[PDB]
């Protein structure tokens, strides 16, 4: 990714983590950010099978549910490898002022 190692945020296309759901080397996006798991598919309680299902795609279905418990908020930060592509990073125009609470009444 040129220069000396890092700069700034990571991508990776959608199109790439689409091709990375498998055995082989498995990734995933829970909402923004991609992870890994290719040697993680073992460590993780109930993992391997499951997760093939829900990655290289969103996988918060089964974390929006469920919530999972405070461990695994604190614990997954390593397997955080970057961010999503601007395929998804602006989406639209990028949120410019705050995601919405636009005129909540009264002053902001
Ligand atoms: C971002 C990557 C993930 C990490 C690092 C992670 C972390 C953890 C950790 C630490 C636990 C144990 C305690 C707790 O519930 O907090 C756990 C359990 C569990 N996780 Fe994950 N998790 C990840 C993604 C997922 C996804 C995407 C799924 C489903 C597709 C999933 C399903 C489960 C289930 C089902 C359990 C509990 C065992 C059971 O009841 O079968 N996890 N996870």
Redesign the pocket.
């Known amino acids: 990714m040129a220069e000396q190692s890092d700069e700034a945020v990571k991508y990776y296309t959608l199109e790439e983590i689409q091709k990375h759901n498998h055995s082989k080397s498995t990734w995933?996006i829970?909402h923004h950010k991609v992870?890994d798991?290719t040697k993680?598919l073992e460590e993780?309680?109930?993992?391997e099978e499951?997760?093939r299902?829900?990655?290289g795609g969103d996988?918060?279905?089964?974390?929006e549910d469920?919530g999972?418990?405070?461990?695994?908020?604190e614990?997954?930060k390593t397997?955080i490898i970057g961010e999503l592509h601007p395929d998804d990073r602006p989406k639209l125009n990028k949120p410019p002022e705050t995601l919405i609470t636009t005129i909540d009444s009264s002053s902001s």
């Not at 996988?59 to 974390?63: D, G, K, P, Q, S």
């Not at 999972?68 to 908020?73: F, Q």
């Open positions: 995933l829970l992870y798991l993680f993780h309680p109930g993992g499951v997760l299902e829900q990655a996988a918060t279905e089964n974390f469920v999972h418990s405070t461990d695994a908020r614990m997954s397997f």
